[PDB]
A paper describes a structure:
In our AQP7 structure, X-ray crystallography captures AQP7 monomeric pores in a unique closed state in which F74 and Y223 block passage of small solutes. Crystal packing analysis reveals 2 stacked AQP7 tetramers interfaced at the EV so that neither the N- nor C-termini participate in crystal contacts. Despite a resolution of 3.95 Å the high crystal symmetry (F4132) and additional presence of non-crystallographic symmetry (NCS) makes it possible, in symmetry-averaged maps, to resolve electron-density features of many amino-acid side-chains as indicated in Figure 3B. Uniquely in AQP7, the NPA motifs are NPS/NAA, eliminating the proline-stacking interaction characteristic of nearly all AQPs. The crystal structure of AQP7 reveals (a) the arrangement of the NAA (94–96) and NPS motifs that form the NPA constriction in AQP7, where the van der Waals packing of A95 and P227 in AQP7 replaces that of the conserved prolines in GlpF; and (b) that residues F74 and Y223 in the SF establish a wedge that excludes glycerol, suggesting that our structure captures a closed state. The SF of AQP7 can exist in two alternate states, one represented by our structure, with constriction diameters of only 2.1 Å or 2.2 Å in each monomer, and an alternate state revealed by MD simulations, with a constriction diameter of 3.5 Å. Although H2O would permeate through the narrow SF constriction in our AQP7 structure, the hydrophobic wedge formed by F74 and Y223 in AQP7 cannot accommodate the larger glycerol molecule. Moreover, 2Fo-Fc simulated annealing omit maps show clear average densities consistent with glycerol in all 4 monomeric pores of AQP7. The two NCS-related AQP7 dimers comprise two monomers with 3 glycerol molecules (Glycerols), and two monomers with 2 glycerol molecules in the monomeric pore. Interestingly, monomers with the inward-facing Y67 orientation house only two glycerol molecules, whereas monomers with the outward-facing orientation of Y67 have three glycerols. In stark contrast to GlpF, we observe no ligand electron density at the selectivity filter of AQP7 (SF).
Numbering used by the authors:
A (entry chain A), B (entry chain C), C (entry chain A), D (entry chain C): 32 to 280
């Protein structure tokens, strides 16, 4: 049943965003002591609930890039890939809407205090990822592909039962721990936008909620690299597994 | 027998408060370096000990709402729901008393130094949850309903053995990290008062311990929303499971 | 084989102290950002390695109080109890000696800078536990018995295989998590001196390393309550298990 | 085959550096709020991903000393030890290069702002470990030998299936938390340079990247003690197991 699979992908990427976008909205509009580790450990734990909640029906894709890499390297149906990508896009667009509906007055009061009419530099940083001042567009690629490819290589190493002792239940906890490490050690280079649907659907909402063109560009065009560099990174990560380790098991 | 269930619900909600109220009492009266994540991670870990201790004989109903939603969607005995709720109330009222008996002089010295005669503004924040300055009564509902409904939806997804990775033992640990995420990403909006018995029984004690009406109102009528918003949130979260995922298993 | 059991109890309480005493020496003599959670999470993780390392031969007692409670409530040989208590006393006295041998110059330079001739108020706080200014001797009892009794009731609930799904390997990780919660929510009341041998053997060393009478008294006599209140608390915690929950499984 | 083992030791020590060097590079060039625990917890979690990824074909020898001690006490092929060590060196030299390629402009802007021409005093602290101002060369030995010997003694106790609770899958996670404890309780004494290949291959890169002699000496001759003290510590830790516990199983 497909609408069985789609429905979980809507909700499970939601849990990811509300738990991932909630913790950063808490950071900029709620004066919370959130350190780099406190946003990664909560995001990685949140993506683990997304694995736990929606494991049975989908396999917990929650990523347009791990779905495109499971088709090219994991014999997942190509008939399922478009229906999947449109569901965890819509599930993240609605995720941002509810976290802004619950923080509604935290925006108008933080912006009112700091006299931010255009928040496309700090406040929108909550919904989706944005580059640091000290790098540029082609550097985000190298950063997003090299990390999404490392996610794909553990996501295959944890689900690989022909590898070190299989983790019956601890699989989803370490997949979180993994992104915790990628967000803690490289999250400040691009925001660890591992997922094209973790970053674009919130942008199209933030576009709606009064941020405009700058939600896509982010000063210097930035919406391309969250959508294409992860898809170009998860494939590089999937091939290097089946060749460098999978051909060795 | 039933007096087994009640006795554990008394003790198991106790473990929650003393571990949860202890960690925040440490914040205002013991000059501890405690972040939002360190109080959520300690509360969620504490609720996990509450699952572990009193799971085999109770099912770990540490929530007047998780009991009311397991009765409406989990065929729990309706004869057991009132007796269940009175043990987890009395177990939390006694929980606050022991943590106030152990911190007794930390109150009288903190207030004596800061000339706090009426502490229903900061210090009672220890026992139960209180709204932030920037929102109001109808705002707690959206926050408490939308989050208790996210709790109920994992608490069902974690105990769902027809969802792919079965968690033999990691169930109670992942329920903890879940509230760690809800307290870290939305805990400053209402205090994540997910349980009507996590918030009312400590208030009736703080009422006794010299805080007065303001323990119930907290500036504005804040004792209603912990008691009614979780119950209306756990039902929405329980129906949203069996409809959006359960009809998807 | 007994010297088989003793040898592990020497070493496994060592691992506890070096990992537990190391993190606090790092706090006072090495200017490390250690928050209340960073000392509890590292101690609880350290006591978990102590369970992991020395599980097979002893059962990971590491506590003169859990050994005296396993004899009265767990049919452990009374012939083994004295040989056990003298080993994880000596194992903690040597543990403090090596952590002071590695931090040797961090004492003489911190004391040299802060002109501390007598360090029995802050510096010795690293080796063993010491009361806060705002409570007294009879209050430490209530604090140490009520917490050591909560340790004993989880340590029995995690090893109880007739309770919720047994934790094959995750047992030792949650025993740490438990003390993490007791040190995070009540560690500032007495130092969570759960173990009589975690606190006395380091004192007899600190007595040696140039701290004198004040290592035992701590301003106001303090060495009695770490040694007797845990033994009086682990028994209260062991009886309440087999009666309030064990008689219900 | 052997070229399977080498290839994974290249990649698996890479994962360690990029996750370990990334998290501390974030500290000096990215103005991140990073505590001692947040860098140890991220390094130890990263070393756990190194165990998980390359366990089935290597056994996860991510340490020139853990290989040399598994050969002397674990009947590992002596023919495999040199080829093993050259892959985990080259894999760490390339690891630093990719984390310096991703942080490239964060160096030139941090040094340009702080007028750091020679950064072998703070910034190279990113790639490899460096002594603190308050100790000297013979002090690193006691610290590096006593800790690498504690690592080797758990790494054997975790993989010891004749020790009570067998950890099917939790093995790699608990090895991580162990170094989290060693980096949190003794990491400021030497940088917990437990692996000769965690500390030398990044230096030879930092030598290349414009840091010069001072990457090897670090004020005083500090490149020797990461290479020789771990090897002398892992042997003491391996013998202390099979003698104090292994003859106790």
């Amino acid at each position: 049943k497909m609408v069985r699979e789609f429905l979980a992908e809507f909700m499970s990427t939601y849990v990811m965003m509300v738990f991932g976008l909630g913790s950063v909205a808490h950071m900029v509009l709620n004066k919370k002591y959130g350190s780099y580790l406190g946003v990664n450990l909560g995001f990685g734990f949140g993506v683990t609930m997304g694995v736990h909640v929606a494991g049975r029906i989908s396999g917990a894709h929650m990523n347009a890039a791990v779905t495109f890499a499971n088709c090219a390297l994991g014999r997942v149906p190509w008939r399922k890939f478009p229906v999947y990508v449109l569901g965890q896009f819509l599930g993240s667009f609605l995720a941002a809407a509810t976290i802004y509906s619950l923080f509604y007055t935290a925006i108008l009061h933080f912006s009112g205090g700091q006299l931010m009419v255009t928040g496309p530099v700090a406040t929108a940083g909550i919904f989706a990822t944005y580059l640091p001042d000290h790098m540029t567009l082609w550097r985000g690629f190298l950063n997003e592909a090299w990390l999404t490819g490392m996610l794909q290589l553990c996501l295959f190493a944890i689900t690989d039962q022909e590898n070190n002792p299989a983790l019956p239940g601890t699989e989803a906890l370490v997949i979180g721990i993994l992104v915790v490490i990628i967000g803690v050690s490289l999250g400040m280079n691009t925001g660890y936008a591992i997922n094209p649907s973790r970053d674009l659907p919130p942008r199209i909402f933030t576009f709606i909620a009064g941020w405009g063109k700058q939600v896509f560009s982010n000063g210097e065009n930035w919406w391309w690299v969250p959508v294409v560099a992860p898809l170009l990174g998860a494939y590089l990560g999937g091939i290097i597994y089946l060749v460098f380790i999978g051909s060795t098991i």
